[PDB]
């Protein structure tokens, strides 16, 4: 019996510039911080026992804003990091299309076919993300917690819960920054109660 709130890091500078981050990072924009604060207000009534985040700067920064001074510990776990994108990190979509067009097409169109020389495949991410989630549940029986992570991680997790194949990884809804997803874990089963809700966000950008 555990309730899991899942969200994505707020808008960063590279998000705006359409630059892939991966394990690299960039600071939250003004909009990002605003959205993260809007989320913190939305959860002010929710009794969070803890907050888990990836070790990425943007994830941690989002988590601090949401906590907003409240007495809640923040734990960092590498298994919650966004997918490792090697050579693509720091580069724009056009720059990447110039480098490896086929792999780039697969990334977005045929996830199951994505197989880089340097970097993780979607299945590597799904496996470590699910382990982290299970470890969190194991430590919070009867409690409610918040998990601040990333886009691909969130998508691999929804795919696992909804029992869908990775080839359909990029299925709707789009996981916007600071969006709210709620998972109810009961009887050893993950039930998706809410997915990608953005009721608290003013201007929604597909970034």
Which residue, among 184, 182, 107, has the nearest Cα to 152 in the 3D structure? 107
Give the method used.
X-ray
Which residue, among 5, 8, 55, has the nearest Cα to 152 in the 3D structure? 8
d(CA 11, CA 67) in angstroms, rounded, equals 17
Q: Which fold has domain 1-207?
A: Rossmann fold (3.40.50)
What are the backbone dihedrals phi and psi of residue 134, each rounded to the nearest 5 degrees, phi first?
-60, -40
Q: What is the token pair recorded at 57?
A: 């700067």
Q: Is 42 marked as binding a ligand? A: no
Q: Is 79 marked as binding a ligand? A: no
Q: Is 18 marked as binding a ligand? A: no
Which residue, among 194, 164, 157, has the nearest Cα to 179 in the 3D structure? 194
Q: Is 14 marked as binding a ligand? A: yes
Sequence-separated (6 or more) residues with CB below 8 Å from residue 166: 111, 112, 122, 123, 126, 156, 159
Answer yes or no: are the C-beta atoms of 15 and 176 closer than 8 Å.
no
Q: Which residues are catalytic?
A: 9, 82
Q: Is 205 marked as binding a ligand? A: no
Q: How many CA atoms lie within 13 A of 100 on its CB side?
A: 15
d(CA 56, CA 152) in angstroms, rounded, equals 14
Q: Is 177 marked as binding a ligand? A: no
Could you give the 3-state DSSP secondary structure of residue 195?
strand
Answer yes or no: are the C-beta atoms of 55 and 78 closer than 8 Å.
yes
What are the residue boundaries of the structural domains of the chain, listed by start?
1-207
Partner residues linked to 50 by β-bridges: 145
């Amino acid at each position: 019996a555990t309730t899991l709130y899942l969200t994505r890091h707020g808008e960063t500078k590279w998000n705006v510039e359409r630059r892939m981050q991966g394990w690299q990072d960039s600071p939250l924009t003004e909009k990002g911080r605003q959205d993260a604060m809007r989320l913190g207000k939305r959860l002010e009534a929710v009794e969070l026992a803890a907050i888990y985040t990836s070790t990425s700067g943007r994830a941690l920064e989002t988590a601090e804003i949401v906590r907003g001074g409240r007495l809640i510990p923040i734990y960092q776990d590498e298994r919650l990091r966004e997918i490792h994108l090697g050579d693509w990190e720091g580069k724009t979509h056009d720059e990447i299309r110039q480098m490896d067009p086929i792999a780039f097409d697969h990334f977005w169109q045929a996830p199951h076919l994505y197989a880089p020389q340097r970097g993780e495949r979607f299945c590597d991410v799904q496996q470590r993300a699910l382990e982290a989630v299970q470890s969190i549940v194991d430590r919070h029986e009867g409690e409610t917690v918040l998990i601040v992570t990333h886009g691909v991680v969130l998508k691999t997790l929804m795919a696992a819960f909804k029992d869908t194949p990775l080839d359909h990884l990029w299925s709707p809804p789009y996981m916007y920054g600071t969006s709210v997803t709620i998972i109810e874990v009961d009887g050893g089963t993950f039930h998706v109660a809410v997915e990608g809700d953005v009721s608290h966000i003013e201007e929604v950008k597909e970034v």
